[PDB]
């Protein structure tokens, strides 16, 4: 099945993850869309922001 997800505006290639952030515009993003592999041993954030969004206003 072909469904768009990450801001990439393209379909889910295969390697993906879901935004583990209270917000995260979506809840499915591709690795080719973002940056990672099999997602770190634990949890990944839909996007470089999806994570920062979970931190909620942080100097980091």
């Amino acid at each position: 099945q072909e469904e768009v997800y990450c801001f990439c505006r393209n379909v889910s290639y295969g390697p993906m993850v879901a935004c583990d952030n209270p917000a995260c515009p979506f809840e499915w993003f591709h690795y080719g869309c973002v940056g990672l592999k099999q997602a770190p041993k634990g949890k990944w954030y839909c996007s470089k922001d999806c994570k920062e969004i979970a931190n909620q206003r942080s100097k980091s």
């Binding site: 290639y13 390697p15 993850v17 879901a18 809840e27 499915w28 690795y31 592999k37 949890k43 990944w44």
Partner: peptide, 9 residues
């Protein structure tokens, strides 16, 4: 996080 993967080309 809920993930769905299939390796990368």
């Amino acid at each position: 996080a809920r993930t769905k993967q299939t390796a990368r080309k």
